Design a protein around this nucleic acid. Structure first.
Ligand code: ZN
Lengths: 66, 1340, 288, 251
DNA sequence: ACCGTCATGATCATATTATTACGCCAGACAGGG
DNA sequence: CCCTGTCTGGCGTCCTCTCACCTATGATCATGACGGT
RNA sequence: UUUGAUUUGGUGAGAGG
């Protein structure tokens, strides 16, 4: 279901901007999880270009130049 | 006959039903409750005496001392209301209490105390109520609002359906005490019976029945009947009453008297019961399998062994029968446990019980209350006697005992406040009866189960909580000191009492700030039945059913006036005729319809007495005697409307206005509006603003005079008489002699309230509306208030409206207004803003208010005087200086020589920086009033001494004029007495006037009266001396103020806001609208007479938003103005009074059987000219709510004027000058300006201040802030492909500080470019997550 | 309430009628003012489950996609195929309904001209590409989404479709509320699916399968009606037959579950003993 | 920070940290003094509950409180909830160069432009006006320009009509549900104090004119002006994204 | 008029108790056929 | 040991505007006013 | 070895859309 599916994501900021932050931050902390940003709300949190709209060319460039 | 202000402008009144009970005093809830609270009340209850006699006498911890109670008394307040609102104090009265200390001796607490002491003691300050029904807490006029909560008593609810997911309903029985521990009996899906106390852990219910010292044999004696088995020579015969066998299938062939009655495999019919009870069958025969599961009642013991044969509440087997049969028992008592009739709920409950006696039950109850501690029999007895059975911790009120006896079908409604054994046993009996299928559950929203608290009861409860804290303190101190040496003011202290009552009146959830911008808004905020607050529900949790109108709100709580939004139906408003019962419920009037005739006696019914009887509807036709003219009449029996016969009715409603409230009974043609639009119309009629010259409603309901006079904005005459001196400040009434006291000679002075600030920044003015030499009657208006006119209620103004689409400028809901409206200065409302400036006390020294100010020149300081404060009258702009104040210097550059002060200049060389505190802008105004308050000790400057001399001079002149005016009335009394009995016609005015007593006159009533007037005169002399000394003391003294403030300067700006595109106007039916274009005069659609229409609405809002009442209001307003134009035509031609009398009489008859029936033949040729002087701007018409003016009456009144019958005039155009096809509707609608203006919402920000913890802009308008680019807007920009717009929308424009300074340099240099960076609030997120044990980082 | 409000608004409502009206309108205001919270929280949950999904390819390179048919509840055909397959790219190439023709190719966007050439040929159902069958890792390819919907063309490489989709489902949350036998209507041809049947003694084709779908196909080829016929019903008609408009074609008794057979013969009571297994209840009012 | 007065309105975290440090100092002193077992067990237990109350308050039994009965807000309550950092300061931010006022109709507009008042226009475009004033040469330092627009002389309105001309703004109605609730217009200056909004566009915003309010936002940088003109312009949103139906239907 | 006594205001660490009245809806837990 | 009531936690709409209200105390040196010589 | 204007926090109640 949609709230169990958005809280079970491979990106803990996406699952922490949404409902309960305690459960998700302890699960991510004891798992040692890492957030390869790669979505819209991680980049709205961290303050950069959205990887969808005009910023999709910027993220193509950055993903190409690694 | 009519009162003299009702011969000024007598309102035309349609309406058919002759009234029998007039509208009561609309503020009776507040005033009657608080009069019930604070008054010397004998016989114990109610009031403060209930608290002082329930918490006292405080007896000590076995020290034989006792602090008992005598009486109480409130002294006068030190400050009256006006000085209290000006200065800022509470409006309180000191509560003196006479307490007594007695101290008993040793070995005889029934012996003599050695010493008593009775004395006066100070405790608390309770705030009094003003005559308007409001409180003044800290200079701001506040209202405590009535609460609607659950009635104390038993309550049998049914948890229907939802539990256990199998449809098996539960039943709980919540006992709701007024003060103490709750008690919930309930069931479970195993059909066991479970008690709980205050929502704690759950126990089986009969554990409390053992706690009341019941043995198990007695419990089964109570909760079941008995079945008798007699062992008489054959198969253990049975006593049988066949009523238990109603529908049961027997296991054998029941025969008796040698006759087969019942066959095996069949059930016992009702006629077989009739056979067995007709033949009087007693003993029948049972098999050995019949008592295989019968449950024994009491214990049987064997006499030989001394053991127990079978325990109580146990099923019987073969061996148990074999044991008790050979022990000598012939009688066997069992229980009847049926499927439908009587379940064994008590029996299964006792089988779940582990306990066996009183002690174990008390131990288990003591253990579920306080978990995990050693119980002791004394502690368990003390706890269970202090839960329910003590006068201290448990108290149903009289309301609680009434509901608890009524819902258990008792007789006496009087009982103790504590419970007993019979009470809990009757609760369990009624719960088992509801589970058995007979009897009904009780709904919650039924208004026989919703009590109304008010100001008096809630203040009593908060005062009682203060008293139980202070009895903790007095029980501490009384037995821990030396006696006798102390007095009962060293023990009791006034801090918790005053803290409790000051916290309740100061900040509660029900002691709220009065919405005061309108007389209607006052008188409908004081009448409010809020469901929220302490003890009630909350907005974001509940619910569905409580937000819905129950069938018993009819005539108690208004169905259509409630705030839409998050709390609909919780902020209910009480109706017009709805009183409050003795206990606290709602009651409403009715007319006792005896068998044929509607008797005109009123008779108050509550919410549960209404259900049993049958009530006729309000507007039922009756022919002059009371006989109902139909033979089917619409009534309502038990919450359900229907059609009943002519003479099975028992009550009729009083008047047809009683379902609605006073907010929504000033709406004309309410029965034509759909209920949503009537709701929005009543709410916006509450939200109006007072204009400059309020006019009148042409189409009212006649309810305006009750709302105006029964509020407190007009100056109602106390004693009638003759006016002597009218002024814009004061009004002097000379009291008539047939209304007048013998002593205290008496001519009254009304000091009006001129231009001062309301709470909503409106302008609460009072204008005198009486002439000079004019008679006034007792109970009559003298000075109109805000939004009043001649004692009526004029909220907005009435304007010429047309319904037509006009070139798109009224597209959705907009309104288009001619410039003729703004030229006449007719919506030009007057607002007043209060600007405060304090002189605080900081380091490097105090502040300066003087005008020797750095960094400023002539152009600023020309508008200040020689001491900083702006003049009274100086018309300022947005951003000038009102009060000059200098201290801001901070620490720009640290003083080189530490604290070098005495060297260069005197004190210092302006520190390091200087900037005279200059103010903002956005508002104009004219400074009308300046207050200066000085903390005592501080040097008064020259303007504070100017204000002190000014107010000394004003108060000196005012008290001297009090003495002169009352002395003039006293000398007029002396002249009136000396007309007869030794009259001197020439000798009276030869001597000075102060000696009118020693003239020739014997010992009569007249020399006695002159001696009494000499007593009054010398009293006025010495009283004037002492009061002028006290008033000089009040002006000359300082005022207690904030910690570390020198002086407070308050300045009142008086803005005059006119009208502009963007304001919100609305009628009285829900037709809202932003006024969209202020056209010139020429563009308006005019008609074939010449007059332009003022406002062009939009027709398309009528068929969807179904408010068809505004079109009938428009047509009847045009009829009213047609009559007014014909009066203006018959008066402008200077016609004699005969033709005016003819036409006014024809315009006042005009209808069916109506109530008005006036005649002008008793107005005597001078009042008719003045009545026509008041009717020439239109004729006011009353239209009551549900008994209004029908269509044919509007047509007949439009035929009296020469207007067209259909109401529609053909209208030309202003632009083209050619006719609009299909003639349009014009008329007058009474439209209101609302105080949602457009130069209070408009705001703009380039770059202002920034918040401190997260570097983002501030929020709001007063703080110069930016609009929240919220989360859904971020989603809406992700939904496009806009990526750079969102990046600068949440990095550059908002948060990143180096990013935004780079941005500002780049914008002022022309390079549109952003250097992004990181949000600083994300670094705040890193510090808050990192401040836990969590290690968040940024890789690479 | 059994007594209506016989008075409109041009005539006056009296007191009781307005009070019943206020019942009906207070319920509506409470429903909107409490419905808006669930509508907003639904939009929040939807844009946070979507949140990631960005059009990131141009073709996933598949041949799978859902089978868009017109939807039919049992009345007249509710939502036509042109509403469901407008602007969505076909999965395999749609055969023209005559015989084996390449009417449209296998990767064409179906705009209005293609949908009109679908409606002229009366095309049955289109196998079209759906977003749930997209093979793209971490995103949705440009063909399996479909038309842009506010642009006439296909979705561009980049445009966030999860957020516009979540907003478009949750945005109408305010307008939504919060709190015998078969009679044919038109006149066409019968077809049966999921059917295993047998002819009874009288002739009415009874069905030995519970899950049988009774379709009414017209003379053109498209499916115009559909119904569900229970196990053991009396069908007045048969397979492939032509009927008249309004003629009853189905009959059953839902209160009596039929235990009808396939063959004939005699009846024996196997493990049916009166006293323990079955019971004797002779009827009262009939005698049989 | 102190509020208006002479006292400091202290935060809740300072109460939490100050209690943990008070208890930790007490526990160090008791382990210095060699108190018995039950004293240091209560002391360490009070420290455990103090730390557990600092981190996530109220997850243990009934939460501690300072004033008056309301519990005080801890670190986890600075993160979680509707008013934490995610939902209140990182997903939604307060925004400079933004404005807000009551809307009204103005049916003379073309549907790519909206009316915008002169007072709001001179406040939202202060840096562009400063840059324009510094380009002409009328003034010198920045102060002079801020005095000029604080006085509002006769020459800054031509400057304002030369910064408006081709510069779109984002109008936004306050409950934005779908993407058609943020649309970009070109301003046309209004004598008045109310945003004039083209009527057809109202059916997209669900905006009637019964007292509604809208916010204006300014695209600062150049890529944002181009995104407002090329993606978010009101001429570009004529079909609703939920379906194929036109959203500029005449109402 | 100077010297001594009662009174009254600054600075400063000490550390937590006597109400109840939402409605689902998952998720984990002791109980028992 | 697989169902099962029962208990515990965790949600519950965005944007805006106005107003008022904000912990007690328990102990002492030193200043400050009052009275005798 | 001497250039600087800078900052108004939780709680609860009520209204508009
Ligand atoms: Zn794909």
């Amino acid at each position: 279901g949609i709230t169990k599916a958005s809280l079970a994501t491979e990106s803990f900021i996406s699952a922490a901007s949404f409902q309960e932050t305690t459960r998700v931050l302890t699960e991510a902390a004891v798992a040692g999880k890492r957030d390869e940003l790669r979505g819209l709300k991680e980049n709205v949190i961290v303050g950069r270009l959205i990887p969808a709209g005009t910023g999709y060319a910027y993220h193509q460039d950055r993903m190409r130049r690694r | 006959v009519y009162s003299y202000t009702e011969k000024k402008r007598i309102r035309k009144d349609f309406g058919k039903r002759p009234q029998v009970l007039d509208v009561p005093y609309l503020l009776s809830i507040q005033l009657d409750s608080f009069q019930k609270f604070i008054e010397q009340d004998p016989e114990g209850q109610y009031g403060l005496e209930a608290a002082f006699r329930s918490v006292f006498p405080i007896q000590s911890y076995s020290g034989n001392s006792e602090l008992q109670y005598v009486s109480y008394r409130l002294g006068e307040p030190v400050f009256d209301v006006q000085e209290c609102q000006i200065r800022g104090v509470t409006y309180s009265a000191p509560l003196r209490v006479k307490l007594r200390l007695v101290i008993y001796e040793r070995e005889a607490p029934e012996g003599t105390v050695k010493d008593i002491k009775e004395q006066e003691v100070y405790m608390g300050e309770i705030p009094l109520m003003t005559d308007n029904g409001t409180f003044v807490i800290n200079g701001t006029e506040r209202v405590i609002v009535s609460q609607l909560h659950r009635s104390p008593g038993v309550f049998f609810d049914s948890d229907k359906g939802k539990t256990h997911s199998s449809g098996k309903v539960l039943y709980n029985a919540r006992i709701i005490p007024y003060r103490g521990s709750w008690l919930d009996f309930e069931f479970d899906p195993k059909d066991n019976l479970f008690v709980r106390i205050d929502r704690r852990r759950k126990l089986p219910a009969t554990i409390i029945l053992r706690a009341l010292n019941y043995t198990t044999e007695q419990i089964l004696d109570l909760f079941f009947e008995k079945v008798i088995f007699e062992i008489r020579d054959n198969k253990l015969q049975m006593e049988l009453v066949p009523e238990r066998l109603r529908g049961e299938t027997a296991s054998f062939d029941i025969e008796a008297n040698g006759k087969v009655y019942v066959e095996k495999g069949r059930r016992i019919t009702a006629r077989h019961i009739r056979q067995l009870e007709k033949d009087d069958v007693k003993l029948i025969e049972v098999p050995v399998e019949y008592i295989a599961g019968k449950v024994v009642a009491k214990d049987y013991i064997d006499e030989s062994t001394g053991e127990l044969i079978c325990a109580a509440n146990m099923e019987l087997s073969l061996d148990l029968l074999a044991k008790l049969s050979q022990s000598g028992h012939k009688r066997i008592e069992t229980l009847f446990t049926n499927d439908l009739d009587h379940g064994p709920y008590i029996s299964e409950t006792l089988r779940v019980d582990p306990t066996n006696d009183r002690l174990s039950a008390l131990v288990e109850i003591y253990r579920m209350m306080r978990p995990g501690e050693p119980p002791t029999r004394e502690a368990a007895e003390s706890l269970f006697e202090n839960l329910f059975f003590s006068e201290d911790r448990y108290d149903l009120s009289a309301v609680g005992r009434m509901k608890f006896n009524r819902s258990l079908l008792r007789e006496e409604i009087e009982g103790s406040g504590i419970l007993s054994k019979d009470d809990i046993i009757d609760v369990m009996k009624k719960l088992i009866d509801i589970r058995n299928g007979k009897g009904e559950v009780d709904d919650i929203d039924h208004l026989g189960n919703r009590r109304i608290r008010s100001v008096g009861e809630m203040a009593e409860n908060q005062f009682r909580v203060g008293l139980v804290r202070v009895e903790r303190a007095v029980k501490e101190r009384l037995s821990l000191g030396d006696l006798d040496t102390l007095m009962p003011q060293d023990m009791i202290n006034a801090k918790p009492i005053s803290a409790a009552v000051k916290e309740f009146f100061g900040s509660s959830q029900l002691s709220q700030f009065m919405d005061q911008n309108n007389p209607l808004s006052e008188i409908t905020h004081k009448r409010r039945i809020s469901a929220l607050g302490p003890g009630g529900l909350t907005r974001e949790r509940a619910g569905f059913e409580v937000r819905d109108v129950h069938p018993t709100h009819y005539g108690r709580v208004c169905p259509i006036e409630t705030p839409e939004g998050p709390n609909i139906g919780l902020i209910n408003s009480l109706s017009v005729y709805a009183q409050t019962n003795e206990y606290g419920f709602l009651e409403t009037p009715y007319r006792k319809v005896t068998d044929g005739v509607v008797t005109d006696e009123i008779h108050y019914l509550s919410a549960i007495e209404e259900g049993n009887y049958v009530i006729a509807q309000a507007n039922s036709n009756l022919d002059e005697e009371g006989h109902f003219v139909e033979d089917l009449v619409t009534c309502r029996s038990k919450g359900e409307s229907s059609l009943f016969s002519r003479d099975q009715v028992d009550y009729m409603d009083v008047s047809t206005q009683q379902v609605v409230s006073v907010g929504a009974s000033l709406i004309p043609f309410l029965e034509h509006d759909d209920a949503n639009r009537a709701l929005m119309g009543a709410n916006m009629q509450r939200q109006a603003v007072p204009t400059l010259r309020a006019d009148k409603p042409l189409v009212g309901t006649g309810m305006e005079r009750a709302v105006a006079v029964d509020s407190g904005v007009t100056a109602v005459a106390k004693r009638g008489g003759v006016v002597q001196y009218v002024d814009a400040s004061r009004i002097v009434i000379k009291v008539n002699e047939d209304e007048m006291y013998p002593g205290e000679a008496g001519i009254d002075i009304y000091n009006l309230t001129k231009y001062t600030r309301s709470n909503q920044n409106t302008c609460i003015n009072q204008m005198p509306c009486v002439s000079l030499g004019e008679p006034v009657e007792r109970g009559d208006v003298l000075a109109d208030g805000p939004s009043t006119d001649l004692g009526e209620l004029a909220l907005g103004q009435n304007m010429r409206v047309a319904f037509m689409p006009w070139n798109g400028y009224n597209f959705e809901d907009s309104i288009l207004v001619s410039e003729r409206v703004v030229q006449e200065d007719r919506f030009t409302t007057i607002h007043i803003q209060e600007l405060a400036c304090v002189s605080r006390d900081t380091k490097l020294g105090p502040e300066e208010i003087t005008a020797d100010i750095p960094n400023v020149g002539e152009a600023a300081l020309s508008k200040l005087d020689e001491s900083g404060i702006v003049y009274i009258g100086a018309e300022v702009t947005g951003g000038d200086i009102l009060v000059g104040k200098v201290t801001p210097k901070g620490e720009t550059q640290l003083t080189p020589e530490e604290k070098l002060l005495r060297a260069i200049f005197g004190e210092k060389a302006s520190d390091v920086k200087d900037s005279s505190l200059r103010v903002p802008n956005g508002v104009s105004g004219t400074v009308i009033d300046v207050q200066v308050f000085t903390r005592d000790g501080v040097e008064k400057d020259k303007r504070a001494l100017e204000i002190e001399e000014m107010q000394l001079k004003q108060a000196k002149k005012d008290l001297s004029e009090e003495l002169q005016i009352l002395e003039a009335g006293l000398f007029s009394r002396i002249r009136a007495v000396l007309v007869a009995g030794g009259v001197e016609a020439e000798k009276l005015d030869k001597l000075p006037r102060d000696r009118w007593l020693e003239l020739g006159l014997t010992d009569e009533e007249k020399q006695n009266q002159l001696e009494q007037l000499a007593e009054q005169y010398d009293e006025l002399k010495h009283e004037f001396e002492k009061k002028l000394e006290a008033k000089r003391r009040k002006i000359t003294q300082g005022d207690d103020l904030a910690p570390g403030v020198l002086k407070i300067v308050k300045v009142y700006l008086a803005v005059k806001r006119r009208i502009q595109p963007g304001d919100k106007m609305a009628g009285r039916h829900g037709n809202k609208g932003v006024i969209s274009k202020i056209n010139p005069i020429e563009d308006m659609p005019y008609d074939e007479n010449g007059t332009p229409v003022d406002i062009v609405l939009n027709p398309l809002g009528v068929p969807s938003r179904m408010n068809i009442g505004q079109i009938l209001e428009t047509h009847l307003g045009m009829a009213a103005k047609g009559i007014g134009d014909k009066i203006n035509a018959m008066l402008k031609q200077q016609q004699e009074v005969a033709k005016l009398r003819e036409f006014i009489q024809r315009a006042y008859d005009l209808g069916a059987d109506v109530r008005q029936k006036v005649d002008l033949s008793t107005f005597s040729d001078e009042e008719v000219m003045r009545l026509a002087e008041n009717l020439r701007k239109g004729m006011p018409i009353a239209t009551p709510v549900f008994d209004g003016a029908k269509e044919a009456e509007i047509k007949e009144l439009l035929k009296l004027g020469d207007l067209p019958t259909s109401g529609q005039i053909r209208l030309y155009d202003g632009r083209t000058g050619e006719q609009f096809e299909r003639p349009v509707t014009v008329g007058y609608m009474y439209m209101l300006k609302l105080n949602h203006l457009v130069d209070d919402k408009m705001h703009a920000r380039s770059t202002g201040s920034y918040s401190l913890v997260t570097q983002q802009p501030l929020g709001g308008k007063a703080q110069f802030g930016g609009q929240r680019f919220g989360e859904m807007e971020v989603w809406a920009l992700e939904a496009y492909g806009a990526a750079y717009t969102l990046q600068e929308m949440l990095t550059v424009k908002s948060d990143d500080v180096n990013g935004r300074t780079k941005m500002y340099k780049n914008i002022v240099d022309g390079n549109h470019q952003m250097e992004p960076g990181m949000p600083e609030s994300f670094n705040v997120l890193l510090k808050e997550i990192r401040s836990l044990g969590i290690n968040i980082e940024l890789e690479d | 309430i059994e007594t209506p409000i016989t008075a409109n608004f041009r005539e006056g409502l009296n007191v009781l009628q307005y009070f019943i009206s206020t019942h009906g309108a207070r319920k509506g205001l409470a429903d909107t003012a409490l419905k808006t919270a669930n509508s907003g929280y639904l939009t929040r949950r939807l844009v946070d489950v979507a949140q990631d999904l960005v059009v990131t390819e141009d073709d996933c390179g598949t041949h799978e996609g859902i089978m868009m048919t017109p939807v039919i509840e049992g009345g007249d055909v509710k939502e036509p195929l042109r509403d469901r397959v407008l602007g969505r790219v076909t999965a395999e190439d749609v055969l023209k309904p005559g015989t084996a023709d390449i009417l449209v190719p296998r990767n064409t966007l179906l705009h209005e001209q293609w949908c009109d050439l679908l409606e002229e040929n009366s095309v049955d159902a289109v196998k079209v590409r759906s977003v749930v069958s997209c093979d793209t890792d971490f995103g949705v390819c440009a063909h399996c989404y479909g038309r842009d919907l506010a642009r006439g063309h296909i979705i561009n490489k980049g445009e966030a479709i999860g957020v516009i989709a979540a907003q478009s489902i949750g945005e109408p949350g305010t307008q939504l509320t919060m709190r015998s036998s078969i009679q044919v209507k038109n006149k066409g041809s019968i077809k049966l699916s999921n059917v295993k049947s047998v002819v009874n003694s009288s002739g009415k084709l009874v069905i030995t399968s519970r899950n049988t779908e009774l379709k009414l196909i017209d003379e053109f080829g498209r499916t115009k009606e559909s119904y569900k016929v229970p196990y053991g019903a009396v069908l007045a008609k048969g397979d492939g037959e032509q009927v008249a408009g309004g003629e009853t074609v189905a009959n059953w008794d839902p209160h009596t579950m039929p235990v009808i057979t396939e063959v004939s013969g005699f009846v024996r009571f196997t493990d049916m003993i009166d006293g323990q297994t079955i019971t004797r209840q002779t009827d009262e009012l009939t005698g049989l | 920070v102190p509020l208006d007065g002479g006292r400091f309105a202290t935060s809740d975290l300072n109460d939490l940290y100050r209690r943990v440090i008070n208890r930790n100092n007490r526990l160090k002193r008791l382990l210095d003094l060699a108190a018995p077992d039950i004293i240091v067990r209560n002391e360490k237990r009070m420290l455990q509950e103090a730390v557990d109350a600092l981190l996530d308050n109220g997850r243990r039994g009934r939460a501690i409180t300072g004033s008056n009965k309301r519990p005080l807000k801890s670190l986890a309550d600075m993160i979680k909830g509707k008013q934490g950092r995610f939902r209140q300061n990182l997903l939604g931010k307060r925004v400079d160069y933004s404005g807000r006022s009551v809307i009204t109709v103005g049916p003379y507009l073309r549907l790519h432009q909206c009316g915008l008042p002169k007072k709001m226009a001179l406040e939202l475009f202060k840096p562009f006006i400063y840059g324009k004033l510094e380009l002409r040469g009328l003034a010198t330092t920045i102060k002079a320009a801020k005095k000029m627009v604080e006085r509002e002389e006769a020459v800054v309105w031509d400057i304002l009509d030369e910064v408006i001309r081709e510069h779109p703004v984002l109008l936004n109605r306050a409950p934005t549900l779908h993407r058609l609730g943020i649309q970009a217009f070109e301003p046309v200056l209004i004598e008045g104090k109310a945003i004039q909004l083209h009527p057809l566009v109202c059916a997209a915003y669900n905006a009637d004119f019964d007292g509604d309010q809208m916010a204006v936002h300014v695209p600062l940088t150049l890529e944002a002006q181009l995104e407002a003109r090329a993606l978010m312009m009101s001429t570009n949103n004529i079909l609703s994204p939920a379906n194929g139906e036109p959203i500029i239907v005449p109402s």
